[PDB]
Symmetry: D2
Subunit: 208 residues, 4 copies
């Protein structure tokens, strides 16, 4: 149910640059992480904290610490690694739980091939990272895995989301929180988001 289209000018601006078909795989990739950072700040605003004491240059000081077991960042392989740099900047001690998956372009169905989750995931907040949310198959498939491993409390970070994807996600896991940099118009006959920003995966890696 909770959806957030971060409207911060810096996010709106940086996303703008990513849309130029002329951009380079290098700059494109970087921008992805910059936006990735901002979405992470916006999405971790509700982390619980706790007073602890340490020794400061002037004697014992009381400080705040995010409490609980380290959060886990879940990148959906290939596409997702492009935003990991920026996410990790805000949360460097996060445990990285990778999930490999790719979309069958004929059936538009997801095809999971690899999974490696941190342990005790039931005690952690999961942060799923992925460039797009087109049909929604990949994010939905990935949330099922996390929930199967026993994870509750999940937040999805996307750069651009298509209304269809959002709708499919809400039907499958209303208990999740969606933070996107933009909600586009919809999908074309091939499952690509429009306006959107092309094949994010290929662009980020420089493949075709």
């Amino acid at each position: 149910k909770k959806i957030v289209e971060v409207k911060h000018p810096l996010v709106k601006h940086k996303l703008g640059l990513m849309r130029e078909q002329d951009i380079s795989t290098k700059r494109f990739r970087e921008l992805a992480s910059e936006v990735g950072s901002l979405l992470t700040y916006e999405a971790t605003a509700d982390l619980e904290t706790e007073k602890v004491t340490i020794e400061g240059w002037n004697g014992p000081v009381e400080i705040d610490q995010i409490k609980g077991k380290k959060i886990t960042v879940v990148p959906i392989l290939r596409a997702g690694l492009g935003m990991m740099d920026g996410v990790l900047e805000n949360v460097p001690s996060a445990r990285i739980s990778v999930v490999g998956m790719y979309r069958n372009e004929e059936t538009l169905e997801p095809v999971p091939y690899f999974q490696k989750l941190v342990s005790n995931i039931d005690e952690r907040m999961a942060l799923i990272v992925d460039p797009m949310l087109a049909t929604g198959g990949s994010v939905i498939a990935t949330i099922d895995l996390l929930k199967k491993a026993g994870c509750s409390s999940i937040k999805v970070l996307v750069l651009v989301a298509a209304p269809e994807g959002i709708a499919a996600l809400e039907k499958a896991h209303p208990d999740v929180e969606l933070y996107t940099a933009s909600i586009d118009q919809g999908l074309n006959e091939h499952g690509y988001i429009i306006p959107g920003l092309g094949d994010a995966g290929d662009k980020i890696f420089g493949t075709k």
Copy 2:
């Protein structure tokens, strides 16, 4: 009159880590930027925008662009440089105006020694970045320089602030906006913020 103490959980957490005695020049310097990045996001939430039509991956597309002349980051020399990496990760195109001055460890006042501002400051927003606001003599001294050079919209990003300094900054330039990561108890005999975080300048650079 505008004073924002960013109480986001990642700021309190990274800030707490900076308080440790133990902390090395390397990690202290990173945390200075991390927190500095986050402080910018808050400080730059008001940026104005404009619509534009560029060539997208799938034809014409209207995007957002931050309007007007690039902003300028004004680091107060030495300590200030410690927070630039993070500030420029948000506004990489910003113009850097260095202003160097040190505090008279005796009289507790600012001693200017160098300044090189961008041109056309009239039409530019300025972000003064300095680690600590103790007496406020430094920030206030540099605001004076910028206002003399024609700048009208100024924002100050700080890690820790003493009420004494916030009180001084306010009665000197109330038309300024203060963004701090924490407001501390006050100054001690020799003018240092308590708890505060030591010689921010010395710790960033590793000098004695």
Copy 3:
């Protein structure tokens, strides 16, 4: 045939930092990339160049450009990604051909579960990057994959290496270059490199 063990003091130092059991994932991950950069510099020392004239700050000027199609970096999935940051800082436009295979002490002849190479792989140099070269199994397997695709210029970048692996690799693909930061004593009963540095994959990602 061609084996290089970089003995630059900075490499030895950073690698030495990577051996403290107490180290953290964040720090270990960064260092894996710093060494990764230095290793990349040592392997691209023989890249071909070509003159080109452009518009310099003051009139035309002849410069040197790295001739040929862009090189492709090939990180072996999971661990390999931890050294990606460092490698890309040196070759920011390199195409990223990822290869993923599951490897255990039981996977004597690893098979990819996923892979996505760049096109015209036969007209490029390929830099395979993987933290540990224990039995050689994983790396020699991805060289077969690359050679079949048509690639005929391959360099391998590794953090630590066991004589076992180095020997196997040499027996399997002598026409390849091996750059390593350290050649350790050998392997133990369970397949780990000794001294080595433990399960590089798990430390880098923070899993188990």
Copy 4:
């Protein structure tokens, strides 16, 4: 007397990109550090090591680490800061001793204005970093500074250097090592390196 023009194809390639007139401050500032890192690698290849035994992941391990007092990096204020990022990446533990002095553009001679060096400078290796060595006035002037403070082993890292500056430096201090990415043709009427790369200070900071 010892001069070293790094001829690495990656150093020539990154320097070439810097030659473009249309380049951006962000990109330009970024290449400065990239080349600066490589220069550091080249200049620190002769540092001494000392073995030490620490607790490894699987028990005792003998490691190598750099010997002696931590080195100090001396960026000549303003321009020099543009390369700091890269340098520090190879020696984060370094003590940053800054020195400010702008060149009198009528008398082409340095004008000192700030300095803050680390203690025991006479027991450390100095590392002076400044973008361009035109006439050699600034580097010679700051080496005077360091020698006066008792420093006796200095290395100068620069991106481009004019034969004039190299000659002046040698006459003045032949016991120093000079590392550069390019020895240009000479100085034009107004004392600017040719081809060179414009006014580094301005391009790096985005001023005028």
